[PDB]
Amino acid sequence: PEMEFLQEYIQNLETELEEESTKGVENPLAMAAALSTENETGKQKTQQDILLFGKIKLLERLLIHGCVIPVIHVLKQYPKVLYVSESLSRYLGRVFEYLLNPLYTSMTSSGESKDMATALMITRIDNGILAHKPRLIHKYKTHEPFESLELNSSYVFYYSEWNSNLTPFASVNDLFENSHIYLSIIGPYLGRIPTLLSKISRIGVADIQKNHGSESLHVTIDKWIDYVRKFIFPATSLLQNNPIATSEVYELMKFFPFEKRYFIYNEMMTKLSQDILPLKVSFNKAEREAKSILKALSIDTIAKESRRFAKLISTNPLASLVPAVKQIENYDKVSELVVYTTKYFNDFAYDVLQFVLLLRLTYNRPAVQFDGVNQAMWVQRLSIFIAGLAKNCPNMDISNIITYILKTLHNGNIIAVSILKELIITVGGIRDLNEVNMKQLLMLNSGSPLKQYARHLIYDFRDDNSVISSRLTSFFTDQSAISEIILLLYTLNLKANTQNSHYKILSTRCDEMNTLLWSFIELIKHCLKGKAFEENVLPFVELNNRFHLSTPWTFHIWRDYLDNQLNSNENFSIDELIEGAEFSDVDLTKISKDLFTTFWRLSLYDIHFD
Amino acid sequence: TGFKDFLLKPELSRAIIDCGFEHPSEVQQHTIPQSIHGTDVLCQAKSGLGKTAVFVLSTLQQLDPVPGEVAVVVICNARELAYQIRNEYLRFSKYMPDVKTAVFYGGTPISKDAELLKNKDTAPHIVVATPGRLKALVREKYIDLSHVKNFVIDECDKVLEELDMRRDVQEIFRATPRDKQVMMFSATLSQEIRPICRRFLQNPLEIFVGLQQYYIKLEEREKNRKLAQLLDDLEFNQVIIFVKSTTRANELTKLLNASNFPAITVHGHMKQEERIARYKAFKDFEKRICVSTDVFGRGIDIERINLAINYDLTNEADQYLHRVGRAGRFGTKGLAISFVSSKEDEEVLAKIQERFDVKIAEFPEEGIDPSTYLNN
Amino acid sequence: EDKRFIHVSSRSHSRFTSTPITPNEILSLKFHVSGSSMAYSRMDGSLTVWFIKDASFDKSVEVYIPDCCGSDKLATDLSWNPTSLNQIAVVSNSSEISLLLINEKSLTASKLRTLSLGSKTKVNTCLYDPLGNWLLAATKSEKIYLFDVKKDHSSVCSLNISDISQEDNDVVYSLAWSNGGSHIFIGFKSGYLAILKAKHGILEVCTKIKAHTGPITEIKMDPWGRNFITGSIDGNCYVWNMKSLCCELIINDLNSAVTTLDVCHLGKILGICTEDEMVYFYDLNSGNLLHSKSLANYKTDPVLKFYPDKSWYIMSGKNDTLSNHFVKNEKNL
């Protein structure tokens, strides 16, 4: 056709996508919208001769043979010549795969050098005379560029000198030069060539590992931080159902700082709509596919629907997670169905899920309600989702969520208290002693298997999830947060003695924060059992002097540690009784320190006996 | 915790936090802490307002555990409700390993239940039954009623009225000591049955008694196509579809099960054993879609429903308040959508806005906001 | 193409009015490359080797023997020897690697040897080389062994599993020899694909890639040596080529877990058997999801296996346990 006829077929096809991208029709081919039963109350054939015959067939038959210099000159003049045929992107990928395959087999050398020794065929043997015969193929020539193999014959391209115009290149300084030419034409269109997206990222992981050393790692990492942002990560969003080719891109992204991974993750959700078209159609194809699973999400079909759900969040989790979290802080009984799906995620999905959870915890909303008597209904529904990830799935690093807990407690924040509170009761099995029977209360002080029986009756599971509770404190002791939490819960409770909000509220708020500080101390003594305890927690010769948390709290952390040293040895016995310092709260001038100190030194393990 | 303010045993107040209750009803406010003291009670209240919660919490404080003797006797109306008393007696006593509770009803061999009571590993301190069955056990020396201290008669007006159900409740009262506590509760207590009922009691205590709504103004044949548009636009927890017939109600789920919306059917014209199990799985979150006739209009409390669509609109304003009283329970937001398809339909809403003072506004062509029924 | 019924004693068991369970279970099924033998194994039943000369199936019943591997233990898998036609390397559960011979003239089965390397906890995997010059017996618990066959069955070297991967106590579900006989492809529990070099007697790993996030159930190979196909407990069944070691096709038909994978000797149809008693067929050279057939199997666990010589279809899956053989299925409706 002409050029002013093709430019009005481009605008006719660009409007049709945007009309389906904003709202569009959605599934008219359903058996409810088609059939309506009640018992008692022209230009098409012209636009088929644009693809098959004309300029567009000329422009894609020049890429099959070798002629790249005219096609690059055309597709820089009119870039919207794509969105017309899907075959014009597969042939800019077959040219680029030739220029990179000598490069890719040099870095991953000794594997692929043995993989021409792996690529061998079975020999057809005979039963009667015990022969050993190879296979017989034939070599035919066709006009189709991609190689095939029939039952007995192979189909090779006829024009065997198609590649003599093109030249493969050196290590990295031409791949960063031949990609501004070729990969700026098919910008977000490498999702149709999913094998070429793996081979560029497998170069990038094998380039940092080869340049490991000690010196060239600051510039070699910042080199691929602009090559993943520009045209490797936008090519991933135009992928439909592809779990494996998405993890290869993340394997090169594990070598990045987590701060500049959240810049790429946030760029994809503001350049989504305000910018380039064919991923704007694909971000709206997943949001209407994520919402079609959260409506058909049931407890009987979850065997076949969780594998269908996790496959979608393995491919495009920037789109299928902001819907899926929006129905977590609104409706429960799907929070128990989302965390059963999370056993089938990949490691790319576990990083955006931590980014989406941090995206909702900091969004501008009233955290406290209109009066102040209740917080909100989402802040208690999000905290059973976060504490449900840390128990079931063991492959999810939640260290940025815990770093959110530490910093905001310095300000004074009701979300960080409510995430921390549900973490202790769910991951650990710590229950409060304020409903307890008197017979069970004496049974909880006798150090015995009866102590293990008294927690079995009060439903306090500590011997069951001892592995999962130690992993949770491992995230607290990595950032050295254990001595920071105890001083922050005590300070905020004591700071809440001057705030004037209500009269019955701060008689419950002071009581609830008091049994949170008791509940965190009891998690420390169960996990840090042995020589690891004294390194994290502060010694009380300085816990009472530097800070000033009062004398029942200082002894409460330390009584069980002085117990096991005093029954160890007689030479070990004399060591801890002299272990002491200044006492601010009590004067040992008129109280006899022999009888005063053995009050706090003794528990009820050795006063009573039955 | 409002139920620790009943000043109960610490063992009994543990599972109430695990039971989720926090606010006592007005029927529970007036008759439980006086039943702890040991005097008899006489109660009248509405159905489903916490009538069964009176006698479960009252008897677990009073019982002293004795190996192999019964201490609580409950007589009831049918075989179905006695299975519901058993499931609630164990729930408040999940943390008491010594107590046990079994259920007796008809259709079961009595001598096989005699092996249940003779073996001490299933010999309970609490026995619940219908008096149609509990009369049949004592007449062959199976159970002994000489160590019981609490007697419970639920639905006391509906049991004592029939003369065949009057004879079996009298012999158990003669087979037990009269130095005892007798508890009597029912839903409807008239002036005629209350001189009859006072024969068992000694000094008794007497007790006598938003939502966004929208309608679509459309013609007759667009609403089987508006069904698959209102489903794939709205983000719903669980949906209920109300059909005023049984012929259209079974054609719809065969249309919905092939449109990849799994659903169930519960209404009349079907077995009552199927009506319990199919309504149980809908509460068990087995499926999210159910269609029903006007049986499920009044009284059903399932809080996971927030979208109720009216396939065939009512003729009155006294049935419509019941169908949309299910969605948006206890301050939750919900939606009420009605299909206007007849001439008498527009007169129904014209009397609704003047009676209930509620403005059923017009459906906007752009659709509703997603943040007015989730966030707001 | 017509339905013809398989004539073992399993059809006589169900034809009688026998209530509880008529045969019991199927453990393994392997073919020799000659394509006339069979190793039809059971749990407490019989491991029945077969030799049918000319007819379809109605010529002769060869041998059923319960007391072949003893009378106390069971056999996990039966490896046939590519070199010797009369040799089948059966490995029992606890401590027996015995080597049996079959006789066609007599109604018996004799044993050549029973060799064992000590501290053998449980060997569950035995498979020869495609040319028949090695034997890698691999435990799912401690380590992997390596022997020979051409001189005798003598040990050479062994590798401990904890040097391959470093996460946790991993289980080896299935492993597969390369097609040249020079590499080992092994499938872990957490979705690791490790490639071991086994040239003659040295056992060293090359690289490990993350296939997916589940127990890799089966690994098969293409008779033209272009690609290899893996399975999963997810719905994924990728197709990895060998010259570049990347993915080409994706069979995303995620309706259940994957249990059994087979290819054809020409390399065209991929047969996937899931856990919802549904089987499929696909294409390798063509696009992603292009079925040729789907078949609903009944209530019990089926097995699927392809002949090495000509395309003939072995399924199981009758009312309790029986195999079905579909003759002349070049079109399959």
Side-chain angles (χ1 to χ4, degrees):
Chain A
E2 272 68 29
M3 187 48 70
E4 303 313 287
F5 182 84
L6 203 66
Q7 259 177 304
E8 306 214 19
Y9 174 83
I10 282 167
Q11 297 288 323
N12 190 80
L13 210 54
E14 168 167 342
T15 300
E16 185 260 329
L17 298 180
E18 182 255 330
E19 278 314 304
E20 288 206 8
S21 174
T22 299
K23 215 193 82 183
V25 74
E26 273 287 84
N27 206 348
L29 293 174
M31 300 188 186
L35 277 76
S36 164
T37 295
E38 291 185 322
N39 282 313
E40 294 91 5
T41 298
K43 265 272 171 153
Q44 192 267 345
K45 199 162 145 69
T46 299
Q47 304 181 352
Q48 185 69 21
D49 285 344
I50 301 294
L51 318 177
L52 275 178
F53 310 125
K55 297 184 165 195
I56 307 298
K57 178 91 152 185
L58 171 75
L59 210 63
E60 77 183 6
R61 273 280 146 171
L62 278 176
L63 271 174
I64 295 179
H65 288 278
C67 214
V68 173
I69 319 291
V71 187
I72 300 302
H73 194 93
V74 162
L75 295 175
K76 197 168 183 180
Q77 298 293 106
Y78 299 101
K80 293 159 219 213
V81 168
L82 302 99
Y83 338 127
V84 173
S85 59
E86 74 154 40
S87 281
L88 199 148
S89 281
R90 290 188 300 151
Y91 300 146
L92 282 170
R94 167 200 191 244
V95 172
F96 202 86
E97 193 174 45
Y98 175 78
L99 307 188
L100 179 139
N101 195 249
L103 175 60
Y104 160 82
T105 195
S106 70
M107 300 194 166
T108 84
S109 70
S110 199
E112 305 315 297
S113 312
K114 280 280 212 142
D115 274 321
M116 67 205 63
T118 316
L120 269 294
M121 309 164 223
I122 320 175
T123 73
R124 174 202 200 83
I125 80 180
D126 293 290
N127 51 345
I129 47 155
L130 196 75
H132 306 260
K133 310 186 298 186
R135 292 175 180 267
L136 316 168
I137 76 168
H138 313 299
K139 285 289 297 304
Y140 288 171
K141 298 177 171 306
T142 51
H143 279 265
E144 38 195 358
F146 293 124
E147 285 62 31
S148 180
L149 209 164
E150 208 207 328
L151 312 173
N152 214 342
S153 56
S154 159
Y155 297 132
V156 66
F157 197 29
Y158 83 107
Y159 189 56
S160 42
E161 45 262 42
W162 75 267
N163 40 52
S164 314
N165 174 39
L166 302 144
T167 167
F169 44 80
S171 59
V172 148
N173 287 115
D174 312 309
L175 186 53
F176 274 72
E177 189 41 64
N178 302 121
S179 311
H180 296 255
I181 303 163
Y182 285 67
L183 288 191
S184 279
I185 303 310
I186 43 164
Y189 262 111
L190 293 96
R192 317 208 160 151
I193 324 157
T195 318
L196 199 78
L197 203 50
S198 293
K199 288 192 191 197
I200 304 172
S201 309
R202 268 183 196 174
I203 282 173
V205 57
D207 173 85
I208 308 303
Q209 292 184 338
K210 168 197 71 185
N211 206 353
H212 185 80
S214 87
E215 181 50 278
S216 199
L217 205 84
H218 164 53
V219 179
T220 323
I221 278 298
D222 191 76
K223 206 156 72 174
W224 297 86
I225 205 69
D226 285 322
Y227 200 89
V228 170
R229 165 178 197 214
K230 189 73 181 297
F231 42 82
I232 280 184
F233 192 72
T236 323
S237 314
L238 201 140
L239 262 175
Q240 290 309 312
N241 278 174
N242 202 337
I244 173 62
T246 321
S247 77
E248 312 272 339
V249 186
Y250 192 65
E251 190 85 35
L252 162 64
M253 290 179 86
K254 288 184 189 149
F255 291 85
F256 297 158
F258 85 107
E259 281 183 21
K260 287 191 185 304
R261 257 191 281 157
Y262 287 0
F263 197 91
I264 303 167
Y265 286 162
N266 180 61
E267 185 197 276
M268 208 73 218
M269 303 196 302
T270 68
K271 191 256 295 177
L272 189 166
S273 42
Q274 281 70 12
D275 266 4
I276 190 71
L277 197 88
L279 52 89
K280 172 169 150 187
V281 188
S282 192
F283 266 101
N284 272 266
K285 194 164 180 177
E287 289 177 2
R288 260 157 164 177
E289 192 38 64
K291 290 171 189 169
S292 157
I293 311 294
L294 308 162
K295 294 182 310 202
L297 200 50
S298 81
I299 212 162
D300 46 0
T301 78
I302 211 168
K304 313 180 45 167
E305 194 86 11
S306 53
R307 290 155 188 168
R308 191 174 141 215
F309 195 39
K311 179 261 308 178
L312 173 63
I313 318 183
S314 296
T315 296
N316 207 344
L318 270 298
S320 316
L321 260 172
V322 196
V325 160
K326 191 55 148 42
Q327 303 184 21
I328 288 306
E329 63 187 18
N330 284 143
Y331 306 122
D332 282 331
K333 202 52 179 177
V334 298
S335 289
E336 321 185 0
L337 314 177
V338 159
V339 307
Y340 176 61
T341 299
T342 326
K343 59 152 60 179
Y344 290 150
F345 279 12
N346 54 354
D347 200 76
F348 179 48
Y350 285 126
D351 209 302
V352 279
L353 182 49
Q354 196 178 11
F355 172 62
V356 168
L357 283 173
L358 279 163
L359 182 63
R360 311 301 283 150
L361 288 177
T362 45
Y363 183 61
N364 265 339
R365 275 183 292 191
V368 66
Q369 206 168 6
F370 304 100
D371 315 278
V373 287
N374 301 337
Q375 287 165 329
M377 224 77 66
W378 60 269
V379 72
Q380 202 270 331
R381 278 203 173 103
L382 207 44
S383 316
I384 320 176
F385 183 53
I386 291 171
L389 293 176
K391 162 164 190 171
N392 281 116
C393 72
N395 287 315
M396 175 156 185
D397 194 285
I398 54 147
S399 46
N400 289 342
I401 274 165
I402 284 172
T403 308
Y404 172 74
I405 285 174
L406 262 57
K407 298 180 182 287
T408 58
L409 267 174
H410 290 278
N411 190 311
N413 198 86
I414 54 152
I415 313 170
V417 181
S418 192
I419 297 170
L420 188 45
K421 181 216 156 199
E422 312 263 5
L423 263 169
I424 292 159
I425 321 168
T426 319
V427 186
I430 303 193
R431 288 313 204 87
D432 294 330
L433 317 176
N434 52 8
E435 80 273 6
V436 73
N437 190 7
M438 165 60 41
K439 180 229 178 186
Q440 286 165 351
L441 192 55
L442 294 158
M443 206 170 181
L444 266 173
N445 276 317
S446 89
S448 43
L450 307 164
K451 194 179 204 141
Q452 295 185 192
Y453 193 50
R455 299 217 200 88
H456 181 34
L457 298 187
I458 207 177
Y459 268 39
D460 186 311
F461 309 119
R462 283 179 213 169
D463 215 347
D464 313 328
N465 46 12
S466 53
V467 189
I468 316 169
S469 64
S470 71
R471 187 192 176 269
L472 161 71
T473 56
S474 157
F475 293 117
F476 280 102
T477 194
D478 273 355
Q479 327 190 8
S480 84
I482 286 181
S483 281
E484 308 163 356
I485 292 299
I486 294 156
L487 284 163
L488 268 180
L489 303 178
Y490 185 81
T491 311
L492 212 54
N493 185 22
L494 191 54
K495 198 164 159 252
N497 229 329
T498 183
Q499 182 49 55
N500 195 328
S501 54
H502 211 256
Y503 320 113
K504 198 193 171 166
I505 285 304
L506 53 87
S507 178
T508 303
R509 184 174 292 170
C510 168
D511 184 300
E512 183 46 58
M513 274 275 267
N514 201 1
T515 177
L516 174 62
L517 180 46
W518 182 93
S519 199
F520 187 58
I521 295 291
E522 218 274 337
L523 179 69
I524 295 315
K525 311 170 156 187
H526 183 83
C527 277
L528 316 179
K529 193 168 67 176
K531 310 291 300 203
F533 178 79
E534 54 269 19
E535 317 213 338
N536 282 307
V537 79
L538 282 191
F540 78 104
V541 309
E542 80 187 284
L543 194 51
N544 215 335
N545 301 7
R546 270 156 45 120
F547 313 100
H548 277 332
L549 55 100
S550 163
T551 170
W553 280 118
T554 53
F555 274 98
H556 177 57
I557 322 170
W558 284 112
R559 285 169 190 170
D560 280 14
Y561 190 53
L562 310 183
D563 184 8
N564 69 1
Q565 274 158 317
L566 265 286
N567 69 2
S568 158
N569 263 336
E570 174 76 80
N571 197 284
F572 261 82
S573 70
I574 58 169
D575 298 340
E576 316 287 322
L577 62 98
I578 73 183
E579 212 288 336
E582 189 265 345
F583 265 100
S584 86
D585 317 320
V586 286
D587 47 337
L588 50 103
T589 52
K590 61 184 66 62
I591 322 182
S592 300
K593 213 195 157 197
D594 182 50
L595 57 89
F596 161 76
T597 312
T598 180
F599 203 103
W600 315 86
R601 187 249 172 195
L602 291 174
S603 72
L604 273 185
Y605 172 61
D606 51 2
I607 298 295
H608 185 75
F609 174 74
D610 205 37
Chain B
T1 167
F3 276 67
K4 198 134 172 204
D5 315 331
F6 267 55
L7 287 197
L8 297 199
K9 189 182 291 294
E11 157 73 30
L12 308 192
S13 178
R14 166 173 301 117
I16 303 189
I17 309 302
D18 282 86
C19 275
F21 262 110
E22 69 267 53
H23 195 28
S25 317
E26 281 143 29
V27 51
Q28 309 151 346
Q29 198 165 309
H30 291 111
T31 187
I32 316 186
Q34 280 95 29
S35 158
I36 285 301
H37 211 54
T39 184
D40 289 330
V41 291
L42 166 58
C43 284
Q44 189 201 40
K46 301 149 305 302
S47 78
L49 270 298
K51 162 261 199 193
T52 186
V54 187
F55 79 103
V56 191
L57 321 172
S58 195
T59 181
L60 269 294
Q61 186 145 340
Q62 299 293 322
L63 58 89
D64 42 351
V66 48
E69 301 301 326
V70 286
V72 197
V73 169
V74 178
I75 47 155
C76 80
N77 65 345
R79 324 202 311 238
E80 174 62 280
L81 176 139
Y83 215 80
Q84 187 259 10
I85 307 303
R86 212 272 297 262
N87 265 16
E88 204 184 279
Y89 262 60
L90 57 91
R91 200 190 42 157
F92 292 104
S93 86
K94 291 294 290 183
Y95 307 121
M96 219 170 315
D98 215 38
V99 306
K100 203 172 294 293
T101 294
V103 62
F104 301 109
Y105 56 96
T108 295
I110 305 190
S111 89
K112 297 320 213 307
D113 269 25
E115 271 150 28
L116 193 85
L117 58 96
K118 185 162 240 173
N119 285 57
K120 68 186 316 208
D121 204 77
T122 319
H125 299 168
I126 312 173
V127 284
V128 307
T130 309
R133 181 49 82 99
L134 211 47
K135 183 48 205 313
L137 271 292
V138 68
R139 44 197 294 275
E140 207 146 302
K141 174 69 182 73
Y142 285 137
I143 49 183
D144 211 50
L145 318 179
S146 200
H147 278 44
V148 196
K149 293 194 312 314
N150 311 68
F151 206 96
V152 166
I153 310 184
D154 51 290
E155 278 318 284
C156 63
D157 298 67
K158 309 303 150 55
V159 169
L160 294 205
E161 259 281 356
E162 290 197 78
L163 272 299
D164 311 329
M165 320 178 68
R166 197 161 170 179
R167 294 305 109 203
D168 50 14
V169 308
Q170 191 48 281
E171 205 260 353
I172 175 176
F173 200 82
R174 290 204 35 81
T176 194
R178 273 201 99 212
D179 212 37
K180 209 167 148 200
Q181 327 172 38
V182 185
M183 299 163 216
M184 276 177 30
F185 319 100
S186 197
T188 298
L189 282 74
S190 315
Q191 304 262 69
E192 172 267 310
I193 325 172
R194 60 181 294 274
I196 306 305
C197 276
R198 33 196 284 155
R199 60 166 150 279
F200 301 122
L201 319 179
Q202 291 178 355
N203 191 9
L205 270 160
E206 57 91 19
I207 284 298
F208 283 142
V209 301
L211 174 60
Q212 304 321 290
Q213 324 164 4
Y214 290 95
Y215 81 112
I216 296 147
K217 186 200 162 175
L218 78 159
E219 53 181 297
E220 180 50 59
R221 283 297 207 83
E222 289 165 314
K223 76 183 202 191
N224 204 4
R225 193 254 185 200
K226 204 56 165 184
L227 178 63
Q229 180 190 154
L230 260 297
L231 285 195
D232 308 346
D233 188 7
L234 264 298
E235 285 154 81
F236 63 96
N237 201 344
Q238 268 183 318
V239 68
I240 191 76
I241 309 179
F242 282 124
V243 176
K244 296 222 170 214
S245 66
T246 184
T247 317
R248 297 152 69 122
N250 199 2
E251 202 147 21
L252 198 55
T253 55
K254 193 158 281 294
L255 175 134
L256 278 182
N257 208 353
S259 193
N260 298 164
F261 290 93
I264 40 182
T265 42
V266 57
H267 41 65
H269 204 276
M270 218 71 81
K271 191 66 64 68
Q272 187 81 355
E273 290 276 66
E274 270 285 299
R275 288 174 65 189
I276 292 299
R278 284 194 158 193
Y279 161 70
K280 178 60 66 203
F282 187 75
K283 204 182 185 204
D284 201 76
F285 214 82
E286 212 84 18
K287 288 159 202 324
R288 295 161 68 118
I289 302 194
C290 201
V291 304
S292 88
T293 72
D294 283 29
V295 158
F296 281 88
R298 307 184 162 235
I300 287 90
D301 289 77
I302 295 185
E303 52 183 68
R304 305 187 164 131
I305 285 171
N306 78 308
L307 184 60
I309 49 156
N310 272 326
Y311 200 40
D312 290 328
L313 193 41
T314 82
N315 322 120
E316 64 265 52
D318 291 331
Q319 188 87 29
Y320 174 69
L321 70 98
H322 273 275
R323 286 167 146 189
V324 305
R326 321 269 62 75
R329 279 281 95 185
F330 285 175
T332 324
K333 299 303 296 182
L335 278 191
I337 302 300
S338 290
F339 282 163
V340 175
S341 196
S342 300
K343 192 144 189 283
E344 55 96 12
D345 285 18
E346 192 262 359
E347 321 305 328
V348 172
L349 298 90
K351 300 295 298 313
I352 278 165
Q353 311 175 124
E354 272 186 350
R355 170 192 324 198
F356 293 147
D357 305 332
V358 299
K359 302 310 285 193
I360 302 186
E362 317 296 316
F363 202 94
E365 308 320 297
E366 64 186 2
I368 60 171
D369 292 331
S371 87
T372 177
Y373 76 113
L374 296 190
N375 308 53
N376 262 317
Chain C
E1 193 184 323
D2 204 302
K3 39 191 272 203
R4 59 154 58 252
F5 294 163
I6 288 315
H7 209 160
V8 208
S9 65
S10 74
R11 76 186 290 163
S12 55
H13 265 291
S14 316
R15 264 178 311 170
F16 305 149
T17 174
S18 298
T19 38
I21 191 186
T22 38
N24 50 9
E25 206 266 332
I26 300 297
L27 264 158
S28 198
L29 172 56
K30 287 275 158 161
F31 275 102
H32 184 38
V33 199
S34 69
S36 184
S37 65
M38 167 175 318
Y40 174 85
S41 319
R42 284 181 171 177
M43 174 72 108
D44 298 355
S46 282
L47 60 100
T48 70
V49 292
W50 292 93
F51 294 101
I52 295 194
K53 305 293 182 182
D54 286 5
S56 298
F57 203 78
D58 289 331
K59 199 265 292 171
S60 77
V61 297
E62 289 293 275
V63 45
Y64 75 101
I65 168 67
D67 206 79
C68 182
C69 78
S71 43
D72 43 350
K73 320 293 170 186
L74 56 95
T76 78
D77 42 7
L78 315 192
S79 188
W80 275 95
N81 205 15
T83 302
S84 159
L85 75 169
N86 200 355
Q87 165 163 346
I88 166 166
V90 47
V91 167
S92 315
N93 211 327
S94 315
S95 87
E96 311 93 297
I97 304 173
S98 77
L99 282 79
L100 273 286
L101 262 57
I102 198 60
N103 317 317
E104 301 176 280
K105 65 181 74 66
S106 62
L107 205 45
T108 36
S110 87
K111 176 250 298 182
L112 173 143
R113 212 157 93 189
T114 309
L115 185 135
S116 278
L117 171 143
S119 50
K120 40 193 304 197
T121 49
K122 171 178 47 61
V123 174
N124 38 14
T125 55
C126 75
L127 76 163
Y128 275 105
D129 199 72
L131 313 160
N133 303 63
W134 294 271
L135 196 144
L136 190 136
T139 63
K140 79 177 187 63
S141 43
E142 37 174 330
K143 70 173 62 182
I144 59 182
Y145 299 129
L146 205 43
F147 315 125
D148 291 330
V149 66
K150 57 194 164 315
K151 31 164 185 178
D152 67 318
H153 315 273
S154 81
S155 179
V156 46
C157 173
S158 87
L159 191 45
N160 185 25
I161 282 179
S162 86
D163 311 277
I164 308 172
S165 81
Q166 47 261 20
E167 45 202 0
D168 189 87
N169 314 334
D170 315 327
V171 184
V172 169
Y173 277 92
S174 198
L175 50 93
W177 264 117
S178 173
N179 203 0
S182 86
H183 273 237
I184 286 287
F185 279 106
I186 189 173
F188 270 135
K189 189 195 184 190
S190 84
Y192 274 155
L193 202 79
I195 322 180
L196 286 141
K197 316 171 186 179
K199 308 168 292 319
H200 31 281
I202 297 98
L203 204 64
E204 191 186 36
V205 76
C206 164
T207 190
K208 40 161 184 293
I209 52 183
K210 184 72 174 292
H212 49 274
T213 325
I216 304 177
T217 294
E218 283 223 3
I219 293 176
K220 251 57 179 168
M221 302 279 157
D222 190 13
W224 297 99
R226 306 157 277 162
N227 44 53
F228 62 99
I229 306 107
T230 83
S232 182
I233 295 297
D234 305 336
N236 298 329
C237 311
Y238 308 138
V239 172
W240 312 73
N241 75 324
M242 274 175 176
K243 270 86 170 179
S244 57
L245 204 61
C246 276
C247 202
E248 289 189 313
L249 293 199
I250 297 170
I251 318 294
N252 261 346
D253 204 86
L254 303 89
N255 62 321
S256 306
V258 186
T259 303
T260 292
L261 284 80
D262 301 74
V263 300
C264 185
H265 63 96
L266 305 180
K268 177 179 273 188
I269 52 171
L270 161 70
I272 302 182
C273 164
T274 59
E275 79 182 2
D276 55 351
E277 321 316 303
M278 206 56 55
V279 82
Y280 300 108
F281 301 96
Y282 298 93
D283 198 318
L284 275 298
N285 54 51
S286 175
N288 281 188
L289 295 161
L290 276 171
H291 304 73
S292 295
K293 196 54 175 75
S294 198
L295 199 77
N297 189 293
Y298 311 115
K299 192 267 292 182
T300 192
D301 192 352
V303 74
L304 161 69
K305 197 52 76 180
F306 269 109
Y307 278 87
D309 50 359
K310 184 48 72 154
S311 297
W312 301 80
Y313 174 71
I314 290 186
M315 205 180 199
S316 79
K318 205 251 187 178
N319 286 317
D320 192 280
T321 291
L322 165 142
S323 74
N324 68 62
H325 183 79
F326 269 86
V327 291
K328 314 302 295 180
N329 45 55
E330 60 179 0
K331 57 138 161 182
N332 186 206
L333 265 44

